[PDB]
Design a binder for this molecule. Sequence first.
Ligand SMILES: OC[C@H]1O[C@@H](O[C@H]2[C@H](O)[C@@H](O)[C@H](O)O[C@@H]2CO)[C@H](O)[C@@H](O)[C@@H]1O
Ligand SMILES: OC[C@H]1O[C@@H](O)[C@H](O)[C@@H](O)[C@@H]1O
Length: 445
Amino acid sequence: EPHRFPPDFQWGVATSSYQIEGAVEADGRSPSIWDTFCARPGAIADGSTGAIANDHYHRYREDIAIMKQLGVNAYRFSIAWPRILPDGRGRVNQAGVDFYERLVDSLLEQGIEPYATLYHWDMPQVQHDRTPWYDRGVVDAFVEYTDVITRRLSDRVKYWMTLNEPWVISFLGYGAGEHAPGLRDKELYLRAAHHVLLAHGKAMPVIRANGNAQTKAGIVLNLNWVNAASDSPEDQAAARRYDQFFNRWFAEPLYNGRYPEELLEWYGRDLVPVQPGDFDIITTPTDFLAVNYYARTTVKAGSTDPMLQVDFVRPPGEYTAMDWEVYPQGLYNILNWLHTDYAPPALYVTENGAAYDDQVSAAGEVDDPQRLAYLEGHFEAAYRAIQAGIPLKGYFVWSLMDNFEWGRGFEKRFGIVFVDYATQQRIIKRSGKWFSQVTRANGLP
Ligand SMILES: OC[C@H]1O[C@@H](O[C@H]2[C@H](O)[C@@H](O)[C@H](O)O[C@@H]2CO)[C@H](O)[C@@H](O)[C@@H]1O
Ligand SMILES: OC[C@H]1O[C@@H](O)[C@H](O)[C@@H](O)[C@@H]1O
């Protein structure tokens, strides 16, 4: 009774283009909305940018050898639209495509299966100027990008993800002003949310036509376990609204052709630019649903957030350096909800991980026992999910390595591999050495 995973379980690590690649001007790449936004004062907590990051653009081969040390059989990465179509549409940048050709070729030669994210938040600035997410024109721009890159790579990439975390793209980007392009307006958020779902749905047939019969595609949702602070009818109502906002806003359209009705009413139903036939596109069948899970969020009635009329409560427990509650049972809960409610033929955890404060010891080691316990607890939740019949087919750790953590900059380290930014030295952390044995044993000791 070592608690062992299915024989073909996919163990991986995950990254994104803007977070690791650097070389922002190299080889015809144009600025993204994140190259622009990092210039805004107050936007990035340490005042940094992703200009250099981990220099993975130049160092991908060495990072792939690290992946071999970790024993992963899968790697989740994103493709930078600004490298592929630097004018947003039209003329293909061959040198951009060629990077991803080299990366994928090197992965397959090392026996690592490529899982490619098409959109992980780095729209070309010149394209945003024409089609922000709140503009319906964004959809055909994204499909065109999709068409170009899947035509080149689909002989080698079988697993495709359309867009990473619709909730982040639309709400953090356009509703809270935390993420590029840094706007703060309820209507823009809801419009962006709708066009993200529509971009997903129109890209699906294009991915399948450019591939073969083995091609698999779906979306990536962030989902957290939501909890009411108390039993009071108004804490329960507040938690329900927040869950509709965070967890059901995209899932309900994707599986049931509808937005959560009472939140839609609350917002103002006309702010969502639904045209006839849009739900038919959004519900296009997927091969899987990918989940990015990190925390439990506990909610009470209040006015900290005036849009939703909720406050966040922090229950007594363990918190990461992001101030996120560690709650591995939440992963089981989310996976079981999705299974019972939507019956996806396959689920993947495409992100799960933790930021803790890391230090390189005298001996050159990074001793991260809190990160290791975080991962151990969550792998255990995933194992129980599988035993209950949930079709979880793989698990990607966020992240391969420390990287540019968006509005937190480089101060928040999610890697199981430490990166010394002064030298670009990678050091596998204790959690990474433990992971090295989980992957090889296909399970927990
Ligand atoms: O949980 C509410 C909290 O979300 C923060 O964004 C996270 C999100 O929780 C997670 O699910 C997703 O995968 O990543 C984003 C970006 O780090 C957000 O930064 C907070 O403002 C918000 O209160
Ligand atoms: O915040 C931790 C991670 O959460 C997810 O929102 C994203 O896909 C990552 O790019 C991010 O760094």
